[PDB]
């Protein structure tokens, strides 16, 4: 029912992006450069040690969200600088209408990301769903 | 001051003004947890998302 549209949306949009990463695409194609890098080993040891904990469910759908709505390309340095932290800008966003799942962001994620690597801390999550739905089932 | 001749610049694609209308007029509601399995499970092509 209409109830349901912006997060059937924002989960239909997601669910595009997660297609592409099963048929070995360029997923973006239009976002700016600065944002594509890579994670270096211990960010994504902290990625992986908050992953083990995680509603993924939840965590990658706002994260898809936040970044094809914010990270447009030219001009989103306006408000999301690249050296800040993921834990702060996602509470600050989230505190204006959504009531979902807090503490376990609030209390287990790494505070030192680096939000030059913001793209690639997707990708390892929906990777880690992928894994968990195909390699089991 | 309501009705003052002025010209539109910035254009409304942001999609977050669509997004405070939505929660402005309904009481929007989050999705079951058995209907995104369905809605996954019907929407393994490409061409239909």
């Known amino acids: 029912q209409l109830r349901h549209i912006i ?3 924002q989960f239909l949009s997601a669910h595009k992006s997660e297609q592409r990463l099963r048929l070995n695409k360029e997923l973006f194609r239009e976002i700016d450069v600065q944002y594509k890098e890579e994670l270096s080993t211990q960010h994504q040891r902290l990625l992986g040690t908050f992953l083990n904990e ?4 939840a965590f990658l759908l706002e994260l898809h969200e ?4 914010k990270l447009k390309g030219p001009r989103a340095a306006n408000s999301f600088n690249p ?4 834990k702060d800008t996602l509470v600050s966003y989230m505190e204006t209408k959504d009531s979902d799942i807090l503490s376990e962001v609030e209390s287990q994620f790494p505070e030192e990301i680096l939000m030059s690597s913001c793209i690639s801390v997707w990708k390892i999550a929906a990777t880690r769903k992928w894994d968990r739905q195909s390699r089991g089932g | 001051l309501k009705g003052i ?5 910035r254009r409304d694609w942001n999609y977050e003004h669509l997004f405070m ?7 929007q509601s989050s999705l079951p947890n ?3 399995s369905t809605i996954s499970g019907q929407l393994q092509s490409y061409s239909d998302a």
């Open chain 1, 54 to 57: 995680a509603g993924l469910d």
């Open chain 1, 83 to 86: 050296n800040w932290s993921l």
């Open chain 2, 5 to 9: 001749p002025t010209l539109v610049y």
């Open chain 2, 34 to 36: 058995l209907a995104i």
């Open chain 1, 7 to 9: 997060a059937l949306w």
């Open chain 1, 66 to 69: 936040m970044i094809v709505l």
């Open chain 2, 21 to 27: 209308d939505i929660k402005n007029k309904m009481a």
